Design a protein around this ligand. Structure first.
Ligand SMILES: [Cl-]
Ligand SMILES: [Cl-]
Ligand SMILES: [Cl-]
Ligand SMILES: [Cl-]
Ligand SMILES: [Fe+3]
Ligand SMILES: [Fe+3]
Ligand SMILES: [Fe+3]
Ligand SMILES: [Fe+3]
Lengths: 246, 241, 241, 246
């Protein structure tokens, strides 16, 4: 099993692994560490995979649950996902790459004033079945302790700020998060599988394949409610917790 | 001596006072307090004033030293404490002046923007090359009130890029110059305004079609800002006033 | 009857007039012209006025129908032409009102922003669900002057995303409410203001600490905007006024 | 010789060509058309190339002349470059990808109001030897007739706009231009060569290789002074024209 960095702040390729439910503990743990360290990892040549085997693999790393704007998944809910595992099924003849950004790297690049701002800022995330959650803008990752910015396209405003202030500040933060130095863009080939840490990233689909057929299979793993640098938790304004796969 | 509020967060008219250098301690003190409380105060019917008498008055309150919103001379580290401004020749229309309370603006900031501004430094410049890094929140040395320090001399914030600085400065200026924080004075003959430059910004208004307009200003020495953490402004370039 | 400018680009005081329904054609006409020229006009010493007499005056000028900058009822397609506003009960301080000339603001636009605004549509809404797509430049039906149409009822511009709309609207509002384009009136008992809603925005100011304040407004029917290319506003939802 | 699209709005790979000064007219022309159509093209496996052969090739397509912000090259000059040809010499073990955006695609995605704005807008581009040029924000490409946005990191302001307006509008335009649907990101392998149309693109280096050694060789081809949609030309405020390779 080898892990090779794809860039300075994000991304790694993991080789010498056949994904499935039969991986030993040492291998699952090596994978877990690579995920947490590199934020998004890629396995190539996984042509043996189907839906069931992908699910069997997913169960080893977490509890499975039941596009072209930058976002963190389902952040309108309080207990939004920890991670997802995504395999290519049918790919277009061109385009169709995917972007990830490290929101840990983004936080690390913030100068002190913007650290003080974001560590003391709350965003309303919504899906508009009405989900509204006030999340902190800095989250302390529950497995690594690393601070990560929490924002993305589900943010509708910041508490205490007016609509214009919120629009300007959100875009300032998005501009920083999605700086290319914080990002990896993956050109999918058949057999590829991506896994990302949704507590430490945003991602974005790209509509550059002229609507040619494209099919991916995603399995998403249950996460927990964010805690900020002061130990404060996200507040549910409206909506229910996300639930495991039935 | 009476002090009459002109608005909730800023401005008062002081009546029953003949400005000059012969005012007693009690009266000079009441004037000082009105100024610190109301941020800009106005005296009407001061027709006896000339440059000499204005200066004699000014000396009781301190040591004597357009159309963009600014705090005076903030490209310098020890920028002025206050100014005293008399109408001499007024246009037949227009020519009003605006002041904003930067104390009021700070008090209206929600918690996130307090945490931002209390940890933020702005570079102020006059382009003699004056460049000073001032804190964005200054603690008034006489009242203890916190005031936003920004305005048109700001060229950027330390650690932010040019676009971030442009957007943030305008966000802070939009807050500071909200009309609830401002008083606009239409000058009549004999009017004098005095403002606390440690707690305000002001702005001339170009709405008199360049008719002749003459005012006489006397400016009083101030000290170097202290921020909420006790830190002082940093001279990058230039000398003290 | 005398008309005195208050500023270069906006505002005049009309003296020598006792407002009411018994004014002759000549006087009603001079008042109409002063209004169209100066965008907002003020009458002082109108202590004889009551609701009935204000309405009788209003009927000579048209057909009778807070703290954010807006043009009245622009979420409707045929929004008002003008309003007439009388002080009834005034606070002991604060309580001034601001008007901006959107004609002046249009005239200050450089060529690129004229090309933008002359080809721009804004969605105005009241959230009865009123939604209207208005042009951002309207051609005044009586004067032919071009005026910016924007303000706080704007929710977005057709073809722009939410962030673009937020940034552009604020850019246009920053231009419109530049103090050179505005008049701020401190109300005294007996004061009446009348403004042309086709050529202005206005804004109440919350600087009187919620002391009691009562004004009486009468609003006059207007028509549907025409833009520089002859195009009319589009009702998306709601009825005509 | 084959040309394969890499994405809907930008980028193509050209195969079955050995780059050099010996290419026949038909081949040079096929290359020219591919460049103008796809805005940036890539040739792989060119391990025979050295500086001299790259130059011999460049001479077939134009007249050769004498990083991590998005820009169009040398736009502070009036007659800024038409195109560049870039080969990898020494590559880092990770990171080091390059981004291009199509400013033709960007113009095509503008809604009517922003077309009216930009077609009637002028930007001051500067290098701060003092180069200052007022360029139109829409340029009509001299070979294809296509309209392209002209902006990027050398813009210091727009004529008639104040500093804040200019900052906000430039970023609005950059945000549109650099939307991922308008972009291609190339992971360099040894032997790769990129050629881009500088009249129809912006590009950006990415600092994500932790300053490992990296060496590219660039040859840049002379361009001409922009003309806008009204037939108006760029204005030299200060500085000299760019000059051919001595
Ligand atoms: Cl491979
Ligand atoms: Cl990218
Ligand atoms: Cl005002
Ligand atoms: Cl290959
Ligand atoms: Fe997603
Ligand atoms: Fe000043
Ligand atoms: Fe109103
Ligand atoms: Fe370059």
């Amino acid at each position: 099993i080898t892990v090779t960095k794809l860039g300075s702040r994000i991304g790694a390729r993991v080789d010498g692994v056949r994904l499935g439910g039969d991986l030993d503990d040492a291998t699952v743990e090596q994978i877990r560490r690579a995920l947490l360290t590199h934020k998004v990892i890629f396995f190539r040549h996984q042509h043996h995979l189907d839906d069931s085997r992908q699910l069997e693999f997913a169960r080893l790393l977490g509890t499975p649950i039941g596009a072209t704007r930058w976002h963190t998944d389902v952040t309108f809910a309080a207990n939004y996902p920890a991670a997802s595992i995504l395999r290519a099924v049918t790919l277009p003849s061109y385009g169709g790459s995917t972007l990830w950004a490290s929101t840990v790297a983004a936080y690390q690049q913030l100068p002190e004033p913007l650290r003080h701002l974001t560590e003391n800022l709350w965003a309303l995330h919504t899906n508009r079945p009405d989900f509204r959650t006030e999340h902190p803008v800095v989250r302390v990752h529950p497995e690594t302790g690393e601070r990560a910015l929490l924002a993305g396209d589900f943010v509708r405003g910041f508490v205490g700020l007016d609509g214009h202030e919120s629009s300007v500040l959100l875009e300032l933060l998005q501009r920083r998060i999605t700086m290319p130095e914080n990002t990896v863009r993956w050109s999918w080939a058949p057999g590829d599988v991506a896994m990302w840490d949704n507590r430490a990233t945003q991602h974005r689909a790209i509509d550059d394949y002229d609507d040619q057929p494209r099919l991916m299979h995603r399995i998403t793993l249950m996460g927990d409610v964010p805690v900020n640098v002061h130990g404060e938790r996200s507040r549910v304004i409206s909506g229910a917790p996300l639930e495991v796969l039935a």
